[PDB]
Design a protein around this ligand. Structure first.
Ligand code: FMN
Ligand code: FMN
Lengths: 223, 218
């Protein structure tokens, strides 16, 4: 399977089968992901990988904050820019309507759409959850480094018949997550990555995902 | 060429041939690179791609900043973290001196000079975004950028990501015709690798996974 294909066939998967992931596969995937580039070869990404009931502990501990409502939020950072303007603001809800479409939840059936969202905190039923973090000394370019490593991981997964879903939602409770995991407050939680076998006849995993056209992305000069 | 192979054979290339780059190829590459993920599918990345005489225009303007010594610097942001501790810096010098070893330099600005020539690449990509975007969105840009770099390799092209242009983000933003609504993250030199230049063949170190991955619940 080519890089193009893996890239074409990577999507955020929101339905995993109850099927385990070979730790040997993961370790091998990470060895190659480490070939990701980084400014100054700093390689600032750090990963805690949890499964079973270390992973169940996290879910429960965070679930205990979720029922607190907005009161229980412990944001590591601003997931989206406050006052995100209307260009980007459309892309966010644009896919939202594409994906709730796939499950059957009415457009302003607010109850049901929230119900699908909290599945986030089950890692959509993935057996393994990856927590990507780094030192609080790292700046935005180093966060870009982490993207590069993260995207590598997702492509290798696809290549080896596995799937994933990137999740910033856990940053809503960074401290709780960091606590359960045992990282200190020198560390900052960036994102989670639910890892597992995609349920490829779950409809939540088959609706076509939109991207904007290149005219909104790419400027050409000197040609 | 598989994704594993593509990752394995992507390196920062610092010697490009004069071989021109098919714009049709680049365009196709970007179309599929756009499939990279982004929090909320913001796809916050934007790119200005230059070759020819606008690309020479950018270089000339930055060189004018270079001759200024420290005065000509216009940092978009801070490339490496103030008070980066020497544990992490150890990685930088490990690879840095391995790379200065291959060229013979130890005097070193001559090599650093070559940066702003894009190591002789015919095409230079400038990745930027709105000043409103936060660090998660910068991670998004990373995901797109790594996508682009893997595709170059798969298609027989090569690249070098360059934060050095951020040393003059403002001058560069001017040449590109960008506003101060935008901030420059990085450059990406694009072209065919001069594949028997030795600076393109020395083995690049990575740390072991025991410094990287913690396993729990297994
Ligand atoms: C950093 C990051 C965080 C994400 N967090 C979540 C998340 O918390 N919940 C979720 O459902 N999807 C999350 N996603 C998935 C994105 O919505 C998805 O990448 C985008 O809509 C494109 O869809 P696709 O990846 O399936 O092509 C995240 C993606 C990224 C890059
Ligand atoms: C965001 C970013 C910016 C970079 N900027 C430069 C640069 O300005 N000059 C340079 O020689 N290398 C630059 N690099 C190359 C890194 O030094 C390189 O990725 C790492 O040192 C060596 O790994 P590699 O050759 O396998 O890519 C950059 C890499 C990244 C990810």
């Amino acid at each position: 399977l080519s890089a193009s294909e893996a890239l074409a066939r990577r999507r955020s998967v929101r339905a995993f089968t109850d099927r385990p992931v070979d730790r040997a596969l993961l370790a091998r995937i990470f060895e190659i992901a480490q070939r990701a580039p980084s400014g100054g070869n700093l390689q600032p990404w750090q990963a805690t990988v949890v499964t079973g009931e270390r992973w169940q502990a996290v879910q429960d501990a965070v679930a205990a904050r979720i029922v607190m409502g907005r009161e229980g939020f412990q944001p590591e950072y601003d997931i989206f820019p406050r006052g995100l303007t209307d260009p980007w603001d459309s892309r966010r809800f644009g896919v939202g309507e594409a994906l709730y479409a796939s499950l059957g939840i009415a457009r302003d059936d607010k109850a049901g759409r929230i119900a699908q969202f909290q599945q986030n905190y089950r890692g959509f039923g993935a057996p393994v959850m990856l927590f990507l973090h780094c030192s609080r000394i790292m700046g935005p370019p180093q966060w870009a480094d982490m993207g590069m490593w993260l995207q590598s991981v997702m492509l290798l997964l696809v290549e080896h018949g596995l799937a994933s879903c990137p999740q910033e939602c856990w940053a809503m409770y960074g401290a709780t997550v960091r606590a359960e995991l045992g990282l200190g407050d020198d560390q900052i939680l960036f994102s989670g990555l639910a890892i597992g076998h995609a349920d490829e006849e779950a409809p939540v995993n088959r609706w076509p995902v939109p991207r904007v056209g290149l005219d909104e992305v790419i400027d050409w000069q000197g040609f």
